[PDB]
């Protein structure tokens, strides 16, 4: 499913992005593959788990609503909402590697 890695801030690229940064200081976020975070939010599924993990793949944030995330400096992956994934909490006791792992 949706997977955006190494989301980092970069200058607005288009006129509409330029207006929003000029008038509302919008900091546009882009994944290392060039996808704009704010426009890709609508492509997430509504009832899936959205994971935020660091460069070392420690999960630091979990949600079901991707628009509540600020993934500047992190990665976001969408995973199915299963019992094996509901056990992971926002603490540093769970990592991600094609799935959630214990410790």
């Amino acid at each position: 499913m949706m997977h955006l890695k190494n989301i980092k801030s970069e200058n607005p690229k288009t006129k509409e992005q330029y207006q929003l940064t000029k008038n509302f200081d919008v900091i546009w976020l882009w994944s290392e593959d060039g996808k704009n975070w704010y426009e890709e939010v609508n492509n997430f599924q509504d009832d899936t788990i959205k994971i935020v993990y660091d460069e070392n793949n420690i999960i630091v944030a979990i949600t079901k609503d991707a628009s509540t995330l600020n993934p500047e400096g992190f990665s976001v992956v969408e995973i199915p909402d299963i019992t094996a994934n509901r056990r992971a909490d926002d603490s540093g006791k769970w990592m991600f590697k094609d799935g959630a792992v214990v410790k």
Partner: protein, 358 residues
Amino acid sequence: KAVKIAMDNANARLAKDRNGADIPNKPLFIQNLGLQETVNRARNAVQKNGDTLSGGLTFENDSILAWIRNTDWAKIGFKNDADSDTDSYMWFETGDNGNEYFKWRSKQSTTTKDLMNLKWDALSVLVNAIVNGEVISKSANGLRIAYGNYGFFIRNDGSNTYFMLTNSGDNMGTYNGLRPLWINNATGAVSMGRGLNVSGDTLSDRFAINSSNGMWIQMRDNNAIFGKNIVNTDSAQALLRQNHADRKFMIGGLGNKQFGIYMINNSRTANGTDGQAYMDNNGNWLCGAQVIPGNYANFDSRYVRDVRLGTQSLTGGLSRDYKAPSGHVITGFHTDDKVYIRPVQKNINGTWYNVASA
């Protein structure tokens, strides 16, 4: 004395030298002669130097009664070729210069009043003319009232019928350039060339403005419907009105202050209006109530519509010095002393954006 009988006989006879003076009974002589009817018809004869008659005179053939003098004349006759003659008439004629004419007059005591003259170019009726039938002219300038300074006439030229006017002091003259009113004889359409002023209501199915085209500032002078009387400053004047069942709507204004749309409910009794949407003297558009667009996009793009705190995350439990990332606030602790943080978020125009930290 035998010849005395012959002498007395001769003496009893009419003497030449006496020339009838010796006739003893002259009326009997005339009678015996056969001359009595001659006497009677000459006694009863109309005389050529004038006479009075006690009976009528009848012309039995095509004969004329004439007054003939100075080579000119007046004549009465009766034209009739046969009983079936289809152009038979009593005629009255004058001659011979064209200007001898016909006059009718009447007398009351010693006063004479001329009533009618008929001349080469015109019947002149000096009194009224009252016609029980129809009055028809076959001339284009058929009907004229030549009274006072300006004459008025109706001219039908076969294609259009005009109401015409002469110049001043020329009431018998031709028309000038004025065209107050005319009718198209083929279509019935009425035209007026010098404007129209109506007291009261002018009702029409449609009103067509001969509308103009030009620059913005020329709208002052474009052909339009307009109020001839200026609206007084701070006074109200409507120029257009639409009646609804329970209310009326007006286009109008407050002098020098407002112009636009006003609603007055029929139940209102106090002065004022029930709805107003209008331009003021600075060019603003004002409404006494709400302005409700069907699309708010140009407003929704200007303002924050919501603010919230986003999803909680945990840092790496770390150094003696720490700063929360851009847009984030501290929302908790975990003691390897970790700290909870959340991002502050703002909703602009339906998208949640992360707040920036200066």
